[PDB]
Structure formats: structure tokens, C-alpha cells
């Protein structure tokens, strides 16, 4: 678990490498119906949330992933009013989504109530999202939830992990296409281009067969394997240009929203990939 003051993250999906974070205080460690939940105060990354032994967020750097996964799709849609978030138990994505004036309603489907309880206590900076009046919280498996919906959402965001398994079925993308309005867009966690370029290539070919516009973007974040993570973006609107935001933010807006990673130039740059990845996907 914790060895000699350090928590080390290992997983077969990134063999031969590992991030360790020095620990100041074990805060919590319980098994819910669904996953092993471990929280600690780290020496230099604030509070750290670990699920089934994978670091899922830290207070120091969560703002990059949270802001990008929210703003990439929202600023690529002309008028996002109804939004669905799958997963995102910590509240952080919700936090970022509700900052948009155009958004009237956000539905969140999270499978584990306990993650919600732990975050409210140990990740208050993220869990502040739950105080939004736009929230309709739904407990349950997002896969099954998606079948309940048709032509319902402008934007869907999947903020996944285990239990996230149902979310890696190939019909999930088709279920999402169905749940989306006619010009809806979606954003899912999309693999690290330094770790699983092969999988990004497959996922992209599959999505392109379902959607007229498909794109891949990435952001940096020290505490995810290899220091970065990617996003899969799909649109049912054939005129969507993910690379150039249809809703550019002014500096006033960026300041008002208190963004610390995202802005309109970051948006554009996020789609500019290293040659090896650009070649593979294009």
C-alpha cells in the first residue's frame, strides 16, 4: 500500500514504469461496493485520490484535465445547454461545466455514492461542483444510463476510471451517438499517445465509422502515466471544426472563470501532435 512513506503507482497498462508520491498522512482507505478507495495527503501534491491503485486525481494538478475535458467539447459547440457527465464522482468536471452561462442543466451519472462522499470531504475544491443548482445527480452505471436517452444532450462527457469496464464496450459510443441531439458533440478520455498509440488509432477508425467528425487532443498533467492524457472528440455535426473553437473565450472570460490551464490558444494547440502520432493517425 504505502511503502516507507511513499505510494507507488503500478499498472500492467504501463509496464516497467511507475510514479511514486511521498505520503504525509493516510486519510482514508475503504472498499465500496465497486472499488478500493484510498485517499492520502501527499507531501507536495495536496490531497490524492486513488481508485483500485490508480491515481485518479490530486489537488495540485487536477485543474488541467478537468478544464480540458469540459471546455474542449463545450467551446466546440455553438450553444451547449443540456450536458451529460458520465462518472466524475469527485465533482471537478461539473465544477468546470457549470461556469458556462449557456448551460441550463447538467446530468451526472456516477456509479459509486462513496466516491461522492469521500470527495466532498477530502476534495472540497473539486466537490464544490455539487453545490450548483443546475445539477441533476443520478446514481448508476453510465452504460445502462445511456440506453435511457435519445436525442437528449448537446454535449456528453465521459470522465472514467474496474467498474468503468462497461464504458469500454464498443456499443457505448453508438449509445452516446443516440443520446446526443442531432448536432451534439462528445468528449471521452482517449489514451496517452506515448503509451497506447495503437489503441488511439483503432478507436479513431471506429469512431470515424459512426461520426462525420472525429478528433484527438491532449493535455499535460504530471500525475497521469507519462505526464499527459488524451481526449477523443466526436461530433454528429459534419461542420464541427474541433481544432478551431466555435466559441473562443475572451481574456475577460478566462479570468472570470478562473481558468488555470485552458484558453482558446491552448484549445488549438492541444490538437497539434508530435510527428510520430500525427503520422499514425493521419
Residue position matching grid coordinates 457549470: 98
Q: Decide if residue 140 touches its own copies (CB under 8 A).
A: no
Pick between residue 246 and residue 266 the one whose CB is nearest to its own copies.
266
Q: State the DSSP string of 251-280.
A: HHHHHHTT-SS--HHHHHHTT---HHHHHH
**CB 128 → ligand DSH: shortest distance, Å?**
14
Which listed residue (35, 39, 40, 45) binds its own copies by CB under 8 A?
A: 45
Return the DSSP state at 250: P
Q: Decide if residue 280 touches its own copies (CB under 8 A).
A: no
Q: Decide if residue 274 touches its own copies (CB under 8 A).
A: yes
Give the one entry of ligand DSH, its own copies, none that residue 90 binds, where binding means its C-beta sits below a cut-off of 5 to 8 angstroms depending on kind: ligand DSH
Positions touching ligand DSH (CB under 6 A) are: 51, 56-57, 86-90, 92, 109-112, 115, 141-143, 159-161, 163-164, 166-167
Give yes or no for a contact between 264 and 248, defined as CB atoms under 8 angstroms apart. yes
Per-residue cell: 144: 445502462
Is 67 marked within a binding site?
no
Pick between residue 15 and residue 101 the one whose CB is nearest to its own copies.
15
Q: HSE-up of 74 (CA within 13 Å, CB side)?
A: 28
Residue position matching grid coordinates 484510498: 38
Per-residue cell: 239: 461542420
- How many residues can be counted in the chain? 282
Sheet holding 180-189, edge to edge: 135-139, 105-110, 82-87, 153-159, 180-189, 228-235, 213-220
Q: Decide if residue 27 touches its own copies (CB under 8 A).
A: no
Among 76, 125, 66, 124, residue whose Cα is nearest residue 97: 66
Per-residue cell: 128: 464544490
Pick between residue 22 and residue 105 the one whose CB is nearest to its own copies.
22
- Choices 94-102, 107-115, 137-145, 263-271 (CB under 8 A): range interacting with its own copies: 263-271
For residue 52, indicate whether it is catalytic. Answer: no
Going by their DSSP bridges, the two strands 2-3 and 6-9 should be labelled as antiparallel
Is 142 marked within a binding site?
yes
Cite the annotated binding site for S-adenosyl 3-(methylsulfanyl)propylamine by residue number: 35, 66, 90, 110, 141-142, 159
Instruction: Point out the annotated binding site for putrescine.
Output: 65, 159-161, 224
- Enumerate binding residues for its own copies (CB under 8 A): 6, 8, 15-22, 42-45, 61, 64, 194, 219-220, 222, 226-228, 254, 259-263, 265-266, 268-269, 272-276, 278
Active site residues: 159
Amino acid at each position: 500500500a504505502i511503502r516507507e512513506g511513499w505510494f507507488r503507482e503500478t499498472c500492467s497498462l504501463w509496464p516497467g514504469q511507475a510514479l511514486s508520491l511521498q505520503v504525509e498522512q493516510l486519510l482514508h482507505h475503504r472498499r465500496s461496493r465497486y472499488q478500493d478507495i484510498l485517499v492520502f495527503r501527499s507531501k507536495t501534491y495536496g490531497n490524492v485520490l486513488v481508485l483500485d491503485g490508480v491515481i485518479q486525481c490530486t489537488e495540485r494538478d487536477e485543474f488541467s484535465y478537468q478544464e480540458m475535458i469540459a471546455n474542449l467539447p463545450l467551446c466546440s459547440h455553438p450553444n451547449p445547454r443540456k450536458v451529460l457527465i458520465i462518472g466524475g464522482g469527485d465533482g471537478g468536471v461539473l465544477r468546470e461545466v457549470v461556469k458556462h452561462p449557456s448551460v441550463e442543466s447538467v446530468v451526472q451519472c456516477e456509479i459509486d455514492e462513496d466516491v461522492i462522499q469521500v470527495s466532498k470531504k477530502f476534495l472540497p475544491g473539486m466537490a464544490i461542483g455539487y453545490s450548483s443548482s443546475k445539477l441533476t445527480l443520478h446514481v448508476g452505471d453510465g452504460f445502462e444510463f445511456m440506453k435511457q436517452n435519445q436525442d437528449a444532450f448537446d454535449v456528453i462527457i465521459t470522465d472514467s476510471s474496474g467498474p468503468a469496464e462497461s464504458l469500454f464496450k464498443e456499443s457505448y459510443y453508438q449509445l452516446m451517438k443516440t443520446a446526443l441531439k442531432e448536432d451534439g458533440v462528445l468528449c471521452c478520455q482517449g489514451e496517452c499517445q506515448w503509451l497506447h498509440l495503437d489503441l488511439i488509432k483503432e478507436m479513431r477508425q471506429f469512431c470515424q465509422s459512426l461520426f462525420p467528425v472525429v478528433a484527438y487532443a491532449y493535455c499535460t498533467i504530471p500525475t497521469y502515466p507519462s505526464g499527459q492524457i488524451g481526449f477523443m472528440l466526436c461530433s454528429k455535426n459534419p461542420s464541427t471544426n474541433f481544432q478551431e473553437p466555435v466559441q473562443p473565450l475572451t481574456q475577460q472570460q478566462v479570468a472570470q472563470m478562473q481558468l488555470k490551464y485552458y484558453n482558446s490558444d491552448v484549445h488549438r494547440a492541444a490538437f497539434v501532435l508530435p510527428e510520430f502520432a500525427r503520422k499514425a493517425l493521419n
